[PDB]
Scaffold this active site. Structure first.
Site, PDB file in Angstrom:
ATOM      1  N   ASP A  86     -10.289  21.689  -1.490  1.00  0.00           N
ATOM      2  CA  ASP A  86     -10.704  22.677  -1.523  1.00  0.00           C
ATOM      3  C   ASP A  86     -10.796  22.467   0.131  1.00  0.00           C
ATOM      4  O   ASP A  86     -11.734  22.600   0.442  1.00  0.00           O
ATOM      5  CB  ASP A  86     -12.404  21.667  -1.807  1.00  0.00           C
ATOM      6  CG  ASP A  86     -11.904  20.230  -1.466  1.00  0.00           C
ATOM      7  OD1 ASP A  86     -10.977  19.300  -0.915  1.00  0.00           O
ATOM      8  OD2 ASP A  86     -13.136  19.224  -1.909  1.00  0.00           O
ATOM      9  N   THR A 146     -11.387  14.250  -1.283  1.00  0.00           N
ATOM     10  CA  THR A 146     -11.953  14.648  -2.497  1.00  0.00           C
ATOM     11  C   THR A 146     -10.367  15.060  -3.296  1.00  0.00           C
ATOM     12  O   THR A 146      -9.778  15.467  -2.740  1.00  0.00           O
ATOM     13  CB  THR A 146     -12.844  15.496  -2.206  1.00  0.00           C
ATOM     14  OG1 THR A 146     -12.216  16.850  -1.217  1.00  0.00           O
ATOM     15  CG2 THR A 146     -13.487  15.146  -1.445  1.00  0.00           C
ATOM     16  N   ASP A 166      -0.839  18.095  -0.634  1.00  0.00           N
ATOM     17  CA  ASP A 166      -1.504  16.702  -0.561  1.00  0.00           C
ATOM     18  C   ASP A 166      -2.333  16.011   0.016  1.00  0.00           C
ATOM     19  O   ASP A 166      -2.835  15.117  -0.902  1.00  0.00           O
ATOM     20  CB  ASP A 166       1.139  15.967  -0.788  1.00  0.00           C
ATOM     21  CG  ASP A 166       0.444  14.640  -0.395  1.00  0.00           C
ATOM     22  OD1 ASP A 166       0.221  13.863   0.063  1.00  0.00           O
ATOM     23  OD2 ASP A 166       1.754  14.082  -1.418  1.00  0.00           O
ATOM     24  N   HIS A 192       9.533  14.144   0.084  1.00  0.00           N
ATOM     25  CA  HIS A 192      10.133  13.205   1.983  1.00  0.00           C
ATOM     26  C   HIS A 192      11.595  13.602   1.595  1.00  0.00           C
ATOM     27  O   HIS A 192      12.029  13.540   2.428  1.00  0.00           O
ATOM     28  CB  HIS A 192       9.694  11.841   1.108  1.00  0.00           C
ATOM     29  CG  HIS A 192       8.166  10.962   1.732  1.00  0.00           C
ATOM     30  ND1 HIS A 192       8.026  10.350   1.030  1.00  0.00           N
ATOM     31  CD2 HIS A 192       7.455  11.998   2.039  1.00  0.00           C
ATOM     32  CE1 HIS A 192       6.423   9.710   1.886  1.00  0.00           C
ATOM     33  NE2 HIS A 192       6.671  11.335   2.349  1.00  0.00           N
ATOM     34  N   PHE A 244     -10.425  17.504  -5.559  1.00  0.00           N
ATOM     35  CA  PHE A 244     -10.244  18.691  -5.955  1.00  0.00           C
ATOM     36  C   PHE A 244      -9.979  19.736  -4.520  1.00  0.00           C
ATOM     37  O   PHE A 244      -9.763  19.123  -3.871  1.00  0.00           O
ATOM     38  CB  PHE A 244     -11.815  19.751  -5.274  1.00  0.00           C
ATOM     39  CG  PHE A 244     -13.134  18.801  -6.758  1.00  0.00           C
ATOM     40  CD1 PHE A 244     -12.605  19.122  -7.899  1.00  0.00           C
ATOM     41  CD2 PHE A 244     -14.063  18.369  -6.210  1.00  0.00           C
ATOM     42  CE1 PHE A 244     -13.151  18.154  -9.225  1.00  0.00           C
ATOM     43  CE2 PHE A 244     -14.403  17.293  -7.408  1.00  0.00           C
ATOM     44  CZ  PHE A 244     -14.577  17.588  -8.825  1.00  0.00           C
ATOM     45  N   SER A 272     -10.234  20.270   1.918  1.00  0.00           N
ATOM     46  CA  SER A 272     -11.066  19.207   2.712  1.00  0.00           C
ATOM     47  C   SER A 272     -10.347  18.733   3.626  1.00  0.00           C
ATOM     48  O   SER A 272     -10.929  17.693   5.223  1.00  0.00           O
ATOM     49  CB  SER A 272     -11.038  17.638   1.015  1.00  0.00           C
ATOM     50  OG  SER A 272      -9.982  17.926   1.341  1.00  0.00           O
ATOM     51  N   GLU A 308       0.621  13.541  12.318  1.00  0.00           N
ATOM     52  CA  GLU A 308       1.585  12.434  12.047  1.00  0.00           C
ATOM     53  C   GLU A 308       2.938  13.011  12.512  1.00  0.00           C
ATOM     54  O   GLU A 308       4.658  12.505  12.915  1.00  0.00           O
ATOM     55  CB  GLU A 308       1.562  12.459   9.770  1.00  0.00           C
ATOM     56  CG  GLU A 308       3.018  11.548   9.736  1.00  0.00           C
ATOM     57  CD  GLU A 308       4.167  12.538   9.294  1.00  0.00           C
ATOM     58  OE1 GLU A 308       3.941  13.134   9.617  1.00  0.00           O
ATOM     59  OE2 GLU A 308       5.301  12.156   9.679  1.00  0.00           O
ATOM     60  N   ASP A 345      -4.448  17.224   0.930  1.00  0.00           N
ATOM     61  CA  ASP A 345      -5.916  17.315   1.063  1.00  0.00           C
ATOM     62  C   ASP A 345      -6.457  17.036  -0.985  1.00  0.00           C
ATOM     63  O   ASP A 345      -7.363  16.718  -0.933  1.00  0.00           O
ATOM     64  CB  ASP A 345      -5.559  19.876   0.550  1.00  0.00           C
ATOM     65  CG  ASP A 345      -7.301  19.251   0.390  1.00  0.00           C
ATOM     66  OD1 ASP A 345      -7.674  19.362  -0.566  1.00  0.00           O
ATOM     67  OD2 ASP A 345      -7.138  21.054   0.583  1.00  0.00           O
ATOM     68  N   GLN A 357       3.439  19.074   1.686  1.00  0.00           N
ATOM     69  CA  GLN A 357       2.064  17.810   2.601  1.00  0.00           C
ATOM     70  C   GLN A 357       0.915  18.376   2.731  1.00  0.00           C
ATOM     71  O   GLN A 357       0.198  17.361   2.847  1.00  0.00           O
ATOM     72  CB  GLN A 357       3.307  17.455   4.171  1.00  0.00           C
ATOM     73  CG  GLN A 357       2.084  16.437   4.480  1.00  0.00           C
ATOM     74  CD  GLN A 357       3.070  16.244   6.196  1.00  0.00           C
ATOM     75  OE1 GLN A 357       3.741  17.627   6.824  1.00  0.00           O
ATOM     76  NE2 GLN A 357       3.444  14.732   5.862  1.00  0.00           N
TER      77      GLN A 357
HETATM   78  C1  HEM Z   1       6.521  12.371   8.698  1.00  0.00           C
HETATM   79  C2  HEM Z   1       5.839  12.812   6.701  1.00  0.00           C
HETATM   80  C3  HEM Z   1       6.310  14.003   6.614  1.00  0.00           C
HETATM   81  C4  HEM Z   1       7.019  15.371   7.546  1.00  0.00           C
HETATM   82  C5  HEM Z   1       7.985  15.242   8.964  1.00  0.00           C
HETATM   83  C6  HEM Z   1       6.039  13.895   5.323  1.00  0.00           C
HETATM   84  C7  HEM Z   1       5.996  14.926   4.811  1.00  0.00           C
HETATM   85  C8  HEM Z   1       5.473  14.427   3.190  1.00  0.00           C
HETATM   86  C9  HEM Z   1       6.286  15.734   2.308  1.00  0.00           C
HETATM   87  C10 HEM Z   1       6.529  17.034   2.200  1.00  0.00           C
HETATM   88  C11 HEM Z   1       4.838  15.850   0.918  1.00  0.00           C
HETATM   89  C12 HEM Z   1       4.448  16.606  -0.588  1.00  0.00           C
HETATM   90  C13 HEM Z   1       5.500  17.661  -0.479  1.00  0.00           C
HETATM   91  C14 HEM Z   1       4.769  14.510   1.381  1.00  0.00           C
HETATM   92  C15 HEM Z   1       3.845  13.754   0.526  1.00  0.00           C
HETATM   93  C16 HEM Z   1       3.519  12.280   0.970  1.00  0.00           C
HETATM   94  N1  HEM Z   1       3.256  11.037   1.059  1.00  0.00           N
HETATM   95 FE1  HEM Z   1       4.187  12.236   3.147  1.00  0.00          FE
HETATM   96  N2  HEM Z   1       5.398  12.353   5.006  1.00  0.00           N
HETATM   97  C17 HEM Z   1       5.209  12.052   6.111  1.00  0.00           C
HETATM   98  C18 HEM Z   1       5.346  10.482   6.056  1.00  0.00           C
HETATM   99  C19 HEM Z   1       4.281   9.886   4.986  1.00  0.00           C
HETATM  100  C20 HEM Z   1       3.543   8.289   5.580  1.00  0.00           C
HETATM  101  C21 HEM Z   1       3.976   7.643   6.581  1.00  0.00           C
HETATM  102  C22 HEM Z   1       3.623   7.811   4.486  1.00  0.00           C
HETATM  103  C23 HEM Z   1       2.828   7.086   4.013  1.00  0.00           C
HETATM  104  C24 HEM Z   1       2.961   6.221   2.676  1.00  0.00           C
HETATM  105  C25 HEM Z   1       3.183   4.564   2.953  1.00  0.00           C
HETATM  106  O1  HEM Z   1       2.720   4.222   1.350  1.00  0.00           O
HETATM  107  O2  HEM Z   1       2.007   3.605   2.887  1.00  0.00           O
HETATM  108  C26 HEM Z   1       3.170   9.462   3.238  1.00  0.00           C
HETATM  109  C27 HEM Z   1       2.871   9.648   3.143  1.00  0.00           C
HETATM  110  C28 HEM Z   1       2.666  10.767   1.247  1.00  0.00           C
HETATM  111  C29 HEM Z   1       1.932  10.582   0.284  1.00  0.00           C
HETATM  112  C30 HEM Z   1       1.006   9.565  -0.465  1.00  0.00           C
HETATM  113  C31 HEM Z   1      -0.428   9.517   0.652  1.00  0.00           C
HETATM  114  C32 HEM Z   1      -1.830   8.836  -0.140  1.00  0.00           C
HETATM  115  O3  HEM Z   1      -2.071   9.740  -1.260  1.00  0.00           O
HETATM  116  O4  HEM Z   1      -2.299   7.681   0.244  1.00  0.00           O
HETATM  117  C33 HEM Z   1       2.328  12.215  -0.199  1.00  0.00           C
HETATM  118  C34 HEM Z   1       1.942  12.426  -1.464  1.00  0.00           C
HETATM  119  N3  HEM Z   1       4.482   9.763   3.686  1.00  0.00           N
HETATM  120  N4  HEM Z   1       4.740  13.813   2.888  1.00  0.00           N
HETATM  121 CA   LIG Z   2      -9.590  17.878  -1.815  1.00  0.00          CA
END
Ligand code: HEM
Ligand SMILES: [Ca+2]
Ligand SMILES: *[C@@H]1O[C@H](CO)[C@@H](O[C@@H]2O[C@H](CO)[C@@H](O[C@@H]3O[C@H](CO)[C@@H](O[C@H]4O[C@H](CO)[C@@H](O)[C@H](O)[C@@H]4O)[C@H](O)[C@@H]3O)[C@H](O)[C@H]2NC(C)=O)[C@H](O)[C@H]1NC(C)=O
Ligand SMILES: *[C@@H]1O[C@H](CO)[C@@H](O[C@@H]2O[C@H](CO)[C@@H](O[C@H]3O[C@H](CO)[C@@H](O)[C@H](O)[C@@H]3O)[C@H](O)[C@H]2NC(C)=O)[C@H](O)[C@H]1NC(C)=O
Ligand SMILES: *[C@@H]1O[C@H](CO)[C@@H](O[C@@H]2O[C@H](CO)[C@@H](O)[C@H](O)[C@H]2NC(C)=O)[C@H](O)[C@H]1NC(C)=O
Ligand SMILES: *[C@@H]1O[C@H](CO)[C@@H](O[C@@H]2O[C@H](CO)[C@@H](O)[C@H](O)[C@H]2NC(C)=O)[C@H](O)[C@H]1NC(C)=O
Length: 595
Positions: A188, A184, A108, A351, A186, A190, A258, A110, A105
């Site tokens: 990094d 970003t 992600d 997720h 990268f 962020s 979150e 970052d 997460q």
């Molecule tokens: C609560 C949430 C988490 C933990 C209890 C959780 C966990 C993760 C993991 C472990 C991820 C990768 C290994 C991961 C990736 C991304 N999430 Fe998620 N996440 C929780 C809750 C949310 C919520 C709410 C969203 C918003 C979804 C939407 O479409 O509106 C969410 C998204 C993402 C996401 C995309 C972020 C982006 O690029 O905007 C991951 C890469 N997660 N989460």
């Molecule tokens: Ca970044």
């Protein structure tokens, strides 16, 4: 083809072209093309967007319009028939600690963030969508199917808002809709420092020339820092306990509070920055605040890259690691470092790795109190449990001693997230993260499952029979066909996560491909990658190769017993050693001489 240069980024940019430090916005990383990888730009498209009207309307919007001859099934219905399950027993990953899920997460956040559309400060639209479930402009409701229990207790839908896009945010008429990446591309950190100068500034402690990040002034964790509170009200973190009235935390990334475990991780990193910064002042008394800040920041960014690429990807990608991320042979200015739109869905495999409970353990790694184990849903935007219930140490021990949830075809996403997700904006613990993910694929105009299979050079099932063989599951393949009526229509998120896992990995073939490529690119396209000759010195690099998440815990918490390999399942106290046995980061290589 349409405008090769639309663009509402952060304006004013001028590269230093000699600066040894990344910019906050990511700009200037690539010299020939400065905006590449910068925040607040469109997510990259590896394939053309697929929208109902070919430009911006998601599939599922116009009820009569089909996708390949068929109606696309409701997100929540797919969620109910495929993603849910009741029995949490036997669902834990026997060889991945809770930290495995958690680090994912972090990496992600970052890399990518696509914030929802903003047009509401004064909005009644925020309610024409909430109250009446009326589809309109950026309101794209998740309708409840017939027989869904939420119909009986929550209403007719879940509200849901389309993600922001480039060139306005607002109304109309141009090229295909491209969502924005507010951070970003990268790797990094962020997420610690922010992606806007505006925020990067507010996060710093500019009251003293020490290059430290601001810390909480209201509360302390045994003499250890907390992240400052966000002053802005209304606060969701205040809302879940009107009595404790504890605000969310203020970090480089907006999603920081979150869930309690994510905020725990953020705290550790802020702590490491200040720790690094004061350790550096000790070595270079002469260095000014800015220099202290940038050199610590640079160190922390290397840490994230190292843990991620050395310890974390290998056990996600398994045997596919080498096939997609070959040994580093140097920076390549021809590589596009931008995060692609599909990556932000592929990375959501995490997720299905979230378990239903979080535990707090005491010094002997025993239950901390009578209510040591809590349901995940009671911890969304919950900061009062950290502040007024033990600090972060009991939480961190949990990260090490507990296991992540194992992705399982018959048990995909825990009900804590499938039925009780709490959103920032609304007042109930009743949203469905799985349905949201699905609705969001459509919102982002994602190509279907088979388009991506072909992209990764994998077979493309056209028959139920074909789908059974790829998924290696007769029953799952069947309910999938019953809802989608063709593999071509299977949403990428659920399609990619339904595939069996690769050898020693935690994702299937398709996802390994999508993830592997993305990661090879942000590494190879990063002029500031830690191994890129010149960024750090040979002596500095030797020191950085010694980082470990265990050491990090040792230097920023009062835990004194930690495992050597924090991401694998570790049993206490056999797999735990004293912090002394863990390599420290030797900073002498950063010592500087004037004469
Ligand atoms: C609560 C949430 C988490 C933990 C209890 C959780 C966990 C993760 C993991 C472990 C991820 C990768 C290994 C991961 C990736 C991304 N999430 Fe998620 N996440 C929780 C809750 C949310 C919520 C709410 C969203 C918003 C979804 C939407 O479409 O509106 C969410 C998204 C993402 C996401 C995309 C972020 C982006 O690029 O905007 C991951 C890469 N997660 N989460
Ligand atoms: Ca970044
Ligand atoms: C930095 O990364 C760059 C971006 O990836 C790399 O650029 C790639 O450069 C290669 C060419 O060197 C491009 O194609 C590859 O190389 C050959 C083309 O000259 C191909 O050989 C074959 O071409 C076809 C078969 O596909 C035949 O007709 C031919 O006879 C021969 O068999 C390769 O098979 C391969 O495609 C490619 O377009 C570039 N990548 C892209 C899409 O951007 C570059 O290698 C890197 N720089 C270095 C050298 O470090
Ligand atoms: C809102 O957060 C509150 C904390 O601000 C929390 O109240 C606190 O919770 C428990 C009682 O449920 C108490 O903690 C424990 O320890 C104390 C003192 O050592 C004992 O006296 C108790 O037996 C208790 O087990 C806190 O004292 C209590 N604090 C206050 C001032 O009420 C609420 O539970 C939270 N409410 C919700 C709905 O989440
Ligand atoms: C738990 O996962 C760990 C981490 O992947 C596995 O350990 C790897 O074991 C293989 C054996 O060839 C080696 O290539 C690596 O040395 C190991 N990595 C590390 C850092 O230890 C371990 O096998 C898994 N446990 C079980 C029993 O499957
Ligand atoms: C900015 O950093 C300074 C340290 O230079 C912090 O001020 C210190 O605060 C701590 C805790 O209140 C005290 O032990 C010191 O006496 C203070 N030191 C000095 C030299 O003043 C300050 O809290 C930081 N500011 C923020 C907002 O985090």
């Amino acid at each position: 083809s349409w405008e090769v240069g639309c663009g509402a980024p952060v304006p004013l940019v001028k590269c230093d072209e000699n600066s040894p430090y990344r910019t906050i916005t990511g700009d200037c990383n690539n010299r020939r093309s400065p905006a590449l990888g910068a925040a607040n730009r469109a997510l990259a498209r590896w394939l053309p967007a697929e929208y109902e009207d070919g430009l911006a309307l998601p599939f599922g919007w116009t009820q009569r319009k089909t996708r390949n001859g068929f109606r696309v099934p409701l997100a929540r219905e797919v969620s109910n028939k495929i993603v849910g399950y009741l029995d949490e027993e036997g669902v834990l990953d026997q060889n991945r600690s809770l930290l495995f899920m958690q680090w994912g997460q972090i990496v992600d956040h970052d890399l990518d963030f696509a914030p929802e559309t903003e047009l509401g400060s004064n909005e009644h639209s925020k309610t024409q969508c909430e109250e009446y479930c009326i589809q309109g402009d950026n309101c794209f409701p998740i309708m409840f199917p017939k027989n869904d229990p939420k119909l009986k207790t929550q209403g007719k839908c879940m509200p849901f808002f389309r993600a922001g896009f480039v060139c306005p945010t607002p109304p109309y008429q141009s090229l295909a809709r491209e969502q924005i990446n507010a951070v970003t591309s990268f790797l990094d950190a962020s997420l610690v420092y922010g992606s806007e100068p505006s925020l990067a500034s507010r996060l710093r402690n500019l009251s003293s020339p020490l290059g430290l990040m601001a810390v909480n002034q209201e509360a302390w964790d045994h003499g250890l820092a907390y992240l400052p509170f966000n002053n802005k009200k209304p606060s969701p973190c205040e809302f879940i306990n009107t009595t404790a009235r504890v605000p969310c935390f203020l970090a480089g990334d907006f999603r920081a509070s979150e869930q309690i475990l994510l905020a725990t991780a953020h705290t550790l990193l802020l702590r490491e920055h200040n720790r690094l910064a004061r350790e550096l002042k000790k070595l270079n008394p002469h260095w000014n605040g800015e220099k202290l800040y940038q050199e610590a920041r640079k160190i922390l960014g290397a840490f994230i890259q190292i843990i991620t690429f050395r310890d974390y990807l290998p056990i996600v990608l398994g045997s596919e690691m080498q096939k997609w991320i070959p040994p580093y042979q140097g920076y390549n200015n021809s590589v596009d470092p931008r995060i692609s739109n599909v990556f932000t869905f592929a990375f959501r495999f995490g997720h299905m790795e979230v378990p239903s409970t979080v535990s707090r353990l005491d010094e002997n790694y025993q239950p901390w109190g009578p209510e040591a184990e809590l349901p995940l849903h009671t911890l969304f935007f919950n900061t009062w449990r950290i502040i007024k219930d033990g600090g972060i140490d009991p939480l961190t021990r949990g990260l090490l001693a507990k296991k992540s949830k194992l992705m399982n075809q018959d048990k995909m996403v825990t009900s804590e997230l499938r039925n009780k997700l709490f959103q920032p904006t609304h007042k109930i613990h009743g949203f469905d993260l799985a349905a949201i993910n699905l609705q969001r694929c459509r919102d982002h105009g994602m190509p279907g499952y088979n388009s991506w299979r072909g992209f990764c050079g994998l077979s493309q099932p056209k028959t139920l029979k074909g789908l059974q063989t790829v998924l290696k599951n007769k029953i799952l393949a069947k309910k999938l066909m019953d809802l989608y009526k063709t593999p071509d229509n299977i949403d990428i998120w659920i399609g990619g996560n339904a595939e069996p896992m690769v050898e020693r990995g935690r994702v299937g073939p398709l996802l390994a491909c999508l993830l592997g490529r993305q990661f090879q690119q942000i590494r190879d396209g990063d002029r500031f990658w830690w191994e890129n000759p010149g960024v750090f010195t040979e002596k500095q690099r030797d020191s950085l190769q010694k980082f470990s998440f265990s050491r990090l815990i040792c230097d920023n918490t009062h835990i004194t017993k930690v495992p050597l390999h924090a991401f694998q399942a570790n049993n206490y106290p056999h797999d735990f050693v004293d912090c002394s046995t863990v390599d420290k980061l030797d900073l002498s290589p950063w010592a500087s001489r004037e004469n």
